[PDB]
Structures are given as structure tokens and as C-alpha cells.
Design a protein around this ligand. Structure first.
Ligand SMILES: Nc1ncnc2c1ncn2[C@@H]1O[C@H](COP(=O)(O)OP(=O)(O)OP(=O)(O)O)[C@@H](O)[C@H]1O
Ligand SMILES: Nc1ncnc2c1ncn2[C@@H]1O[C@H](COP(=O)(O)OP(=O)(O)OP(=O)(O)O)[C@@H](O)[C@H]1O
Ligand SMILES: Nc1nc2nccnc2c(=O)[nH]1
Ligand SMILES: Nc1nc2nccnc2c(=O)[nH]1
Ligand SMILES: [Ca+2]
Ligand SMILES: [Ca+2]
Ligand SMILES: [Mg+2]
Ligand SMILES: [Mg+2]
Lengths: 545, 533
């Protein structure tokens, strides 16, 4: 029916998929896609990691944008009843369009697949995937597909698909819609040329769940980040059981590791970083009757020495007055290879200032955003996203050394950080921008800092940032005296940089950049093997000769 | 009962097993057995590593009161041993004077003994090959039992092979005069005979347990892996391999974890691959007191070994000896603490020159020879590695040319293995000349006739020394710099080295030779601590 045009206010759970081919810009494309979804369909309440897979224009686009009909609510939530119901597949409101049963949908899907498996063989590459969950006002899959496709076309590089829409098992075989009919929907949601019309030659049909959901690995990989316990009526198993069977088959039947080709990504500023492929040095700038010029020159010194990131903090004279001048002075000389800037603050107003004057890229929040959850709001703009380091601790520096009793040290801390991540994600922080920090020395005995490093592998799936530099637990490892201990303590840290390099820790926050960079260069050199076969080829040549 | 004493000058090959249950004194004991073997039986021309398996004052006096052998000692270096070659390819030497038995009878007689035994606790094991002038295995067992007595539980010396012979003699009784007559043939005798008559009951060749005890196969595999006696189903290597795998399949044990290969730096046991020791460099190349306080400094900073050299107008000798004399004297003053009596570093001398090493060794100034020419410059130096009651350990390093030419001598058909096999044959030459295998350390010689990429490649492929005692020197060498992207370069070099310390720690390198002892010690403590669960 034409119920489609009713303002009768409802909320649906819509799982999307976003794709692109530009490697140099995948972030800029895909995050822009996100904003539009946030602006035109409802609220992003889950994302996956950004994955790489093998199977000036936009600046002015944001200035000239149409207002949405519905209003953008930036308020923090801690639960979403709709999402909760979606996941268990309990009853949400009935489907607008007609629903096809299990067996019909199953066969009509084989139709589209073999018809494409035929085309592809007669037709004789980088893929950047990213699932999303939307809490949507939009009334039905088709209405969404329309808006989705108008969104796509506004951006012309990008392919946005619906993967799920509530429990709905919808297959529609032949679809066409009028040119004014399209305008009517696009006006139900947007306050409104040679790009509108185009949609009619497309929009040939509508499959929910999307046809290739179970079939393309990259999809099942993203959905495993978000909704692994999900079991759609169509599907024989949960997202995770499906995902896990797919992987143990590509292994047993192809003798090939699928994760070697499809690579999890995280983002510090705007560029791609492959999870576990490099240990970035994050140089510490601790501002301490303060020559800002010294500080800004130390920033340059550290850049030269090898730092990919600068972590500034001051933690009477206020913190704001200790760091903003410096960042402004720095921002200037750079306009007279650019290092990513991290601010070590828990203070909302200081980050806001820094973020409004574009002086920083990452928030380093040692309270894991629990001092002031509102700070999470500052990591979003219309067209901007900032990344964040969440660190574990207990108490403050006066009391933390005594707050040391844990039911399960390793897993308590990991779960803690996992719940924070979920919280930020549930609030539209992109999963791939959230970095984990175990907080060495913060409410841990020395043995516990070590036990934490010993068990750092529990972070294999996640972007990891750690700070050991110059901490007391290093001294605990050892078997003019004050000068020795500071020589010993820096060298001890160098051992942890080595350990970190082998454990593939993504970022290490250090005082001594020169030193750490030397260590990491030698270790990288040793690992850079020109022929990965040579050891056994050369072994055999010697047995033969 | 007297063809055993026939005047016929003979040269046989014998394989011996040496065992003791004393851990604290394993080295001292087994090496004393080795001295007596060299003195009374012939020439040691092969040895295995020393192993720890799982199934003291009088020795010094003993050494001053030993009857002379009647047979010549000859320390000259040799390059080949024809008898040993024959033994290896199962060729026939002279015919046995003891009556042989055939394979069937041998095997049957062996099983009985092993059954009669299944019917009826740390071990230190070592095998030896002896080019022996002793006429026959029974005669040899007599001399061996005398040796065992001279040393007395603390030592068991068994014969494992003797030429190609297969022998099983039950119910032996040697009349007590017969023993004296045998011992007299080989020794200038000047009480304990009566013990030996009761104890020689039978004679088995091969030894019954040769092929049945893991630790024995373990030792023989180091020495004679390709050997196949008539009585054996396979070569020593195959038999060894099949024993290892039977244990993980039929029993799921993995026997390698119960049995540890050992090397020896000075006089104590080290377990191969269990610790990365720091060797602190002392280049005198100046003032004797400044150098000795630097030695003491390095001890405090964590060095287990000090490596002193005067090479890279005034003799090498004059640079190192006085420093070593002073250090030795000062160390004797600061022995008021007897907690600082067993905390003495092992002293290593970095020299290729015989005169310098000779003086050090005569004056008990050093423990280890660090020969950067792998004893090729003057192999006579190999004689100085053996005294009557002492063995010295040695580092063998690969290089080409000399300091001016080495940077040009850089072509290798197969870098990693060329160097590996080179070191392996140097070791074969030393072992052939009676140096215990477990006292020989391998060093790839980083930076000596290697381009920086070749130095790296050697470090990338360091796993090829997994079975061997490994000593490396990366410290402050040019190639570290080739890795980076004036005092800054100094600093970068030290820090780059500490990366290699890390790598060496994980690769379980046995000794690393460093200038920066304190820094290195700090890195290794931290990595060690992260490893303690
Ligand atoms: N659930 C769905 N979501 C999006 N499009 C759908 C869905 N079901 C059917 N379609 C149809 O697919 C077309 C979407 O175009 P799209 O850009 O995704 O093609 P594509 O990029 O070639 O897809 P693929 O890469 O899977 O071949 C529309 O014409 C629409 O009718
Ligand atoms: N090849 C051989 N080497 C040494 N002894 C042998 C050999 N063949 C037979 N024997 C006999 O074995 C006995 C040697 O006793 P030995 O001290 O080796 O026993 P053990 O120390 O208890 O060790 P094990 O019982 O394992 O042989 C002597 O009776 C000797 O006659
Ligand atoms: N993220 C982070 N920030 C820090 N700031 C100060 C000291 N340590 C740390 C630390 O360990 N992690
Ligand atoms: N064994 C050994 N000795 C050395 N002496 C001087 C310089 N380097 C070295 C070295 O690398 N190894
Ligand atoms: Ca929204
Ligand atoms: Ca001899
Ligand atoms: Mg598509
Ligand atoms: Mg015995």
C-alpha cells in the first residue's frame, strides 16, 4: 500500500554496508557516508572495524547541504530498547511491504547469484568495507533504499546496501517508481537534478536480507564485529557460527589463511593504519616559568627523532594555559610528514578549545572518558571524527597505588575497556577510532604491570596503545646512583619497546624518542627478509653440496 | 691366557661412555676421567657434548701421584686419522684376539641380560672416541677399572665399541696375576687389584645398553652419526631419530625436555640455550689501574665474562698481561667476602698469538681463548687448551683476510651455510685434536669480511646455531648504523645494539660480547622478568 507517506512516528533497526575503492581516501569517503546516514536516516548505534579486502570536492558539498526533516539529537544514551529487541528477534511493529516466507526467499536468491556468476565469467582491485547499525525513523526498507541511493548519488566511489531491516524477510522481484513519486519520499525526510532521475533505471528489486549477506566474506567479517549473536530466520546459524565456519573452511579446503588478505584497519587521524603492522612511537610532551618556544622546538626535535604522534599534556596556572599556547605556536611554525597530535586531558573545556581551533587529532583520556562522559560528544562534528585512547585506572595519583585488588587482573581490565568501547560505539564513535590502553602503573603493583604485559596478547584483535616509559615497575625488574637508575630505567624501557615490537603493539608512548626509534629500526631491519623461502632453500643447497 | 700380552704394537678405535651422578662436580670428575683416558689408553679424537639426563679434594692429590704410562704422549696436531676413517666405514682392522660371536647369538645374549635387568637420580653423560694402543677390549676394561678405582658411584666408564668386533663372553675369571700383568704392559706400576677380579664378570661389545639407553644414543649422535655396526639395524642417526619419535608416539613424552645439552665456560655446567650471558669488552689497545677498575666496574654492572684484548710501538703482551696480573692480585685482596669468592667473572683473552696466550695460561690469568681466526693463524695454540689436569674453553670466530683486506673478501656462494660449515670443520679439527666438544663456542664474526646486509642476514638466520654454543659480537659495529633511518650516532649505535640484545635473548644466544654492560644487563633483566610466570 501507499502507507509510505504517513508521518506516524516509528523506529526501525537498519543494518547497512558501505563500500569504496579509493585507498588514498577511503576514510574521507566512508566517514562522509556515515555523517549523511547520521543526518538523513536516524542514529548510528554500532559500527564495525574498517576492513581492507580483496574479493577538494567534498569540502563544498558539506556547506551546501539540505536540512533533514527530522532533528539531530546529540544526547548520550546507555541503552536502546529497539536494538535490544532487534538482536533477540522479538516483536517490533509489522512490515509495511509484503513479506515472503523462508523457502521462497531461499530460491529467489539462487536466481540472482547464478545469473551473476554467469556474467562475471564473461567479464574477464581493493575493497574497503564497514557495516553500520541505524536506529531509523524511515518507515520501510524501500523508502530507505531510496534515501540510501540519493545519498550515494549526492557523493558522485561508494556502494551503500541494506543488510537487514528488523526481522523482515522481504523479496520483491520487479520494481519501478515514478519520478515525482521519488521526490515525494525524498521530501518526507528532506527539505528540498541530473542526479535525481538516475535512480529510476536502478532500483530494479529489493532483497532483505541482502542477497550476498552470507556469501561475501567481507560482509560476514564486519557483522562479526557488531552483531555476532544475531540469528535471522533466513540463516541456519548465528553471524559468529557462520563466520567461524567460513574461516575453518577456507583453511581446510583451500589451505589458505583468509585474514592474511583481508586486513583490519584503525585510524589515528584520516589515514589508514593496518592493525598490528607497525609500532608507532608516540612522543611525550609534558609541559612544565614555561618557555612555549622550548616546548614547540622539542616537538620538532621529537618529530626528527622518529615520533609519528605527539602526546601533549599539562594534566597557580591552568592546564589550558600550559598547552593551548604551545599547540597554537606549533600550529603556526608548521605553516612556516605532519605529526598526529594527541592531548592528554580528561578536561572537557580544554579539548573543546583544542578541537574548535583544530589544534589536536586525538583525545588521550586516562579516565577512559568516565570523568566526563560528555567528552565523547566532542569526537564528532558534521564532517569530522576524532580518535580516542581509552585507558584503565582506579583513583587518582594520591590513592591509586593502594587500589590493587582484582578478581581477575587481565580480564577485568580488558572487559572494562571493552564496555567503554561499546559505550562510545553505541553513541556513534566509529569502532575503528577507539584505542585501548591498560594503564601500566595506574593502580597496579609492579608484578601486575608485568602480568599485564605478559598477557598483552588478549589485545590481538584491538588497536593497542601502552605507556611504560620511565615508570616505577621497570626499576622493579632490575637485580651518582640516581643517574644510574635513570640510565637503567631508560634501557629497561628499551627492552619493553622490543617486547612491544614483537607483540605488535600498535602505539608506545615514550619519553626517549631517539633511543626507541633506534631499537625499532634495528628490529625492523632484522625482520625484513628479502626471500621468505631462502632459509630452507639455502639449507637444502648445503645438504646437496 | 697370554696372547693378550703379545708384543704386537697395535692401533685400535674404541668408543667409551663416561657417567657420573655428582652434579656439582660433573665437570671436574668427567674431565679427570678424560685426562686418565688420554694418559693411559691412547688419544682422544672425538667427544660428544656433555648431557644432563633423567632415565673432591683428593682428585688434585691423585693427579700428583699417578704412575707413568709406558706409552708416549704426543701433542702434535693431526689432520686425519686413518684408523678412525676405517672404523667409520666399518672397514676391518686387525682381527680380534677375543673370540667373536655372530649377530643372532649377540642379540639373544643381550636380551637375556636386559630381561634379567627389567626384573630387579641425575646423570651426567659423555662419550669419547679413543685411538687406543691397548690390544683388546678385555685388556681395555682392566685399565678402565683401574682408572675407575684410582678415582675412588662417582664414575662409570664403559666400552661401547671396539673396532668392528662383536663379542659376548660370559663367566670371565681373570686370575689376579693376569690383571697385574695387563696393567704392567701399559703402566709403570709402583693393593686395589683384588677389587677388580670380582668385578669383571662378562664382556659385551657393543655394550648391551648402547642402543637401548637414550642418553647413550644422544651422545653417539654428536660424534659418529653415520656409523653402522654389524649388530645394528640402522646408523646411529636413524636409531637416535626413531627413539625420539617412539617416545612422542607410543608414550607421548618428547624425550628432549628430560635431557639437556651442556657446554662449559670455565669449570661449571651451563645448560645450552638457557641463559644469555654478557661478555663485557675490555680493549687495552691503556693504564693498568684504570683498566682493572674498569674490570671491577663491569662485574658490578652485570658481566659474567670479561673479554680482554690488546689488538684491533708497544707489544700486545705488555698491554694485557700486567692488567691481568693486577686484576688477579686485586681480586685476591677483595676475597675477604667469601660471597665474593664464587662471584668471579670468567676471564676471556681475545688473541690469536701463542706467546701471549701461553703466558696467560702459565700464570692462571685466563679461562677462555677467544681466537678470531678460529685457531687457523697458529694452530699450535690448540696445544695450550690442554694441561695435565685442565682444559680451557675456546671461541672460534669466522673471518677472512686481515683488517685491511677483510672488507673486500665478501663473496660467498651460500653465506649462512658457508660460515656454518666452516665453524663446524674448525670444531672437527679441534675435537680430533682432543679438545672437548662442549668447550667450543661458535661465532659468526659479525662485520669481519661481511657487508652490512650480510651481517644482518647472519643475524636473521641465527637459528642455524640452535644445537651449538653461540657467542656473538655486534657491539658498536658499523652495520648497526646501516639499520637507522656525532654523539647522536654514538647514542644510536648503543641503542641499536640493545635491540640486538633483545633479539639475542629471544633467539637464546649463549654469549653476547658488549661494550655497554649496564645497558645490556638492564634490557636482559626486563626481558627475563617479563618471562617469569
Ligand atoms: N537490500 C538491498 N540493498 C541495496 N540494493 C538492493 C537491495 N536489494 C536489491 N537491490 C538492488 O541492487 C541495486 C543496487 O546497486 P549497487 O550500486 O549496490 O550495485 P553493485 O555495486 O553492482 O552491487 P554488487 O557490488 O553487489 O554487484 C539497486 O538497483 C537495487 O534495485
Ligand atoms: N663393554 C663393557 N663395558 C663395561 N663393562 C662391561 C662391558 N661388557 C660387560 N661388562 C661387565 O659389566 C660390569 C661393569 O659394571 P658397571 O660398574 O659398569 O655397572 P654399573 O655402574 O651399575 O652400570 P650398569 O649396571 O648400567 O652397567 C662388569 O661386570 C663387566 O664385566
Ligand atoms: N594513555 C596513557 N596516558 C598516560 N599519561 C601519563 C602517564 N601514563 C600514561 C599511559 O600509560 N597511558
Ligand atoms: N669473538 C669475537 N671477538 C671479537 N673481537 C673483536 C671484535 N669483534 C669480535 C667478535 O665479534 N667476536
Ligand atoms: Ca541522527
Ligand atoms: Ca695420549
Ligand atoms: Mg551493492
Ligand atoms: Mg656401567
Amino acid at each position: 500500500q501507499e502507507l509510505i507517506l504517513s508521518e506516524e512516528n516509528k523506529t526501525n533497526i537498519a543494518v547497512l554496508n558501505l563500500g569504496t575503492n579509493d585507498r588514498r581516501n577511503a576514510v574521507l569517503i566512508l566517514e562522509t557516508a556515515l555523517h549523511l546516514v547520521e543526518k538523513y536516516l536516524g542514529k548510528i548505534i554500532n559500527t564495525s572495524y574498517l576492513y581492507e579486502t580483496v574479493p577538494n570536492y567534498i569540502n563544498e558539498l558539506m556547506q551546501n547541504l539540505e536540512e533533514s526533516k527530522y532533528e539531530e539529537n546529540k544526547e548520550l544514551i546507555d541503552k536502546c530498547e529497539e536494538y535490544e529487541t532487534f538482536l533477540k528477534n522479538g516483536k517490533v511493529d509489522n512490515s509495511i511491504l509484503k513479506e515472503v516466507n523462508v523457502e521462497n526467499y531461499l530460491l529467489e536468491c539462487n536466481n540472482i547469484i547464478v545469473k551473476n556468476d554467469e556474467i562475471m565469467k564473461n567479464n574477464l582491485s581493493y575493497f574497503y568495507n564497514l557495516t553500520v547499525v541505524v536506529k531509523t525513523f524511515v518507515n520501510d526498507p524501500l523508502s530507505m533504499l531510496v534515501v540510501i541511493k540519493y545519498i550515494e548519488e549526492l557523493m558522485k566511489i561508494i556502494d551503500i546496501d541494506i543488510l537487514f531491516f528488523n526481522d523482515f524477510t522481504i523479496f520483491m522481484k520487479n520494481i519501478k517508481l515514478e519520478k515525482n513519486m521519488i521526490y515525494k519520499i525524498l521530501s518526507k525526510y528532506i527539505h528540498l537534478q541530473e542526479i535525481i532521475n538516475n535512480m529510476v533505471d536502478n532500483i530494479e528489486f529489493l532483497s532483505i536480507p541482502h542477497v550476498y549477506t552470507t556469501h561475501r566474506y567481507s560482509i560476514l567479517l564486519c557483522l562479526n564485529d557488531m552483531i555476532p549473536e544475531y540469528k535471522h530466520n533466513v540463516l541456519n546459524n548465528t553471524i559468529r557460527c557462520l563466520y567461524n565456519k567460513y574461516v575453518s573452511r577456507m583453511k581446510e579446503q583451500y589451505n589458505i589463511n583468509i585474514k592474511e588478505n583481508n586486513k583490519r584497519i584503525y585510524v589515528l587521524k584520516d589515514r589508514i593504519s593496518y592493525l598490528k603492522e607497525k609500532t608507532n612511537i608516540v612522543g611525550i610532551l609534558n609541559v612544565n616559568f614555561v618557555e612555549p618556544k622550548r616546548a614547540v622546538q622539542r616537538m620538532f626535535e621529537m618529530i626528527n627523532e622518529g615520533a609519528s604522534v605527539i602526546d601533549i599534556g599539562g594534566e597557580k596556572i591552568s592546564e589550558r594555559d600550559l598547552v593551548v599556547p604551545v599547540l597554537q605556536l606549533f600550529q603556526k611554525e608548521w605553516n612556516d610528514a605532519k605529526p598526529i597530535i594527541s592531548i592528554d586531558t580528561i578536561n572537557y573545556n580544554v579539548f573543546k578549545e583544542c578541537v574548535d581551533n583544530d589544534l589536536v587529532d586525538i583525545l588521550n583520556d586516562i579516565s577512559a572518558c568516565t570523568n566526563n562522559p560528555e567528552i565523547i560528544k566532542l569526537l564528532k562534528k558534521k564532517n569530522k571524527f576524532y580518535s580516542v585512547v581509552l585507558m584503565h585506572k582506579r583513583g587518582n595519583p594520591h590513592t591509586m597505588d593502594e587500589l590493587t585488588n582484582y578478581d581477575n587482573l587481565v580480564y577485568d581490565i580488558k572487559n572494562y575497556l571493552e564496555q567503554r568501547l561499546n559505550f562510545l560505539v553505541l553513541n556513534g564513535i566509529p569502532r575503528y577510532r577507539i584505542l585501548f590502553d591498560i594503564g601500566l602503573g595506574f593502580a597496579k603493583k609492579h608484578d601486575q604491570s608485568i602480568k599485564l604485559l605478559q598477557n598483552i596478547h588478549v589485545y590481538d584483535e584491538y588497536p593497542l596503545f601502552i605507556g611504560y616509559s620511565r615508570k616505577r615497575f621497570i626499576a622493579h625488574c632490575m637485580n651518582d646512583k640516581d643517574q644510574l637508575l635513570y640510565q637503567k630505567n631508560i634501557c629497561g624501557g628499551l627492552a619493553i619497546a622490543s617486547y612491544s615490537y614483537y607483540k605488535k603493539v600498535d602505539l608506545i608512548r615514550v619519553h626517549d624518542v631517539l633511543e626507541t626509534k633506534s631499537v625499532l629500526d634495528v628490529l625492523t631491519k632484522i625482520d625484513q627478509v628479502k626471500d621468505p623461502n631462502s632459509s630452507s632453500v639455502d639449507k637444502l643447497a648445503a645438504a646437496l653440496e
